[PDB]
Amino acid sequence: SPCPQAWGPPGVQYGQPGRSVKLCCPGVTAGDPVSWFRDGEPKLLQGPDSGLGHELVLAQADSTDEGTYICQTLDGALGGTVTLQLGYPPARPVVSCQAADYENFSCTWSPSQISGLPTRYLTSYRKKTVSPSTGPWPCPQDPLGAARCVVHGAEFWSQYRINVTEVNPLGASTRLLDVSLQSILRPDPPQGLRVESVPGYPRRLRASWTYPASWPSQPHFLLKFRLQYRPAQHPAWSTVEPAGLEEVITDAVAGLPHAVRVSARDFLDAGTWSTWSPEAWGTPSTGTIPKEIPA
Ligand X SMILES: *[C@@H]1O[C@H](CO)[C@@H](O[C@@H]2O[C@H](CO)[C@@H](O[C@@H]3O[C@H](CO)[C@@H](O)[C@H](O[C@H]4O[C@H](CO)[C@@H](O)[C@H](O)[C@@H]4O)[C@@H]3O)[C@H](O)[C@H]2NC(C)=O)[C@H](O)[C@H]1NC(C)=O
Ligand Y SMILES: *[C@@H]1O[C@H](CO)[C@@H](O)[C@H](O)[C@H]1NC(C)=O
What whole-number distance in Å separates Cα of residue 129 and Cα of residue 158?
4
β-strand partners of 178? 161
Q: Using the minimum distance from each CB to ligand Y, give the nearer residue, 216 or 255.
A: 216
Residue 19 interacts with ligand Y (CB under 6 A): yes or no? no
- Helix (H) / strand (E) containing 154: none
Residue 91 interacts with ligand X (CB under 6 A): yes or no? no
Residue 159 interacts with ligand X (CB under 6 A): yes or no? no
Q: Which of 185, 181, 162, 169 is nearest to 108 (CA)?
A: 162
**Using CA atoms in the order 160, 273, 101, 136, what is the torsion angle rounded to 10 degrees?**
-10
State the nearest-atom distance from the C-beta of 124 to ligand X, in Å. Answer: 5
Of all residues in the chain, what percent are helix, strand and coil, respectively (each to 5)? 0, 45, 55
Among residues 11, 216, 278, 287, the one that binds ligand Y under rule CB under 6 A: 216
Q: Using the minimum distance from each CB to ligand X, give the nearer residue, 167 or 185.
A: 167
State the nearest-atom distance from the C-beta of 13 to ligand X, in Å. Answer: 18
Residue 208 interacts with ligand X (CB under 6 A): yes or no? no
Distance of CA 37 to the CA centre of its chain: 45
Residue 103 interacts with ligand Y (CB under 6 A): yes or no? yes
State the nearest-atom distance from the C-beta of 138 to ligand Y, in Å. Answer: 16
| Number of chain positions touching ligand X (CB under 6 A) | 9
Task: Please say whether the beta carbons of 282 and 197 come within 8 A.
Answer: yes
Name the binder of 167 from ligand X, ligand Y, none, CB < 5-8 A by kind: ligand X
Q: Using the minimum distance from each CB to ligand X, give the nearer residue, 172 or 248.
A: 172
- Return the beta strands (E) in 148-221 as ranges: 148-151, 159-168, 171-180, 191-198, 201-210
H helix runs in 87-130, sequence order: none
State the nearest-atom distance from the C-beta of 102 to ligand Y, in Å. Answer: 9
Q: Using the minimum distance from each CB to ligand X, give the nearer residue, 166 or 266.
A: 166
Residue 124 interacts with ligand X (CB under 6 A): yes or no? yes
Site for ligand Y, residues 150 to 189, rule: CB under 6 A: 152-153
Q: Using the minimum distance from each CB to ligand X, give the nearer residue, 46 or 165.
A: 165
What whole-number distance in Å separates Cα of residue 289 and Cα of residue 48?
108
Strands of the sheet with 171-180, listed across from one edge? 137-138, 120-127, 159-168, 171-180
The residues binding ligand Y (CB under 6 A) are: 101, 103-104, 152-153, 214, 216
The residues binding ligand X (CB under 6 A) are: 122, 124, 136, 163, 165, 167, 172, 174, 176
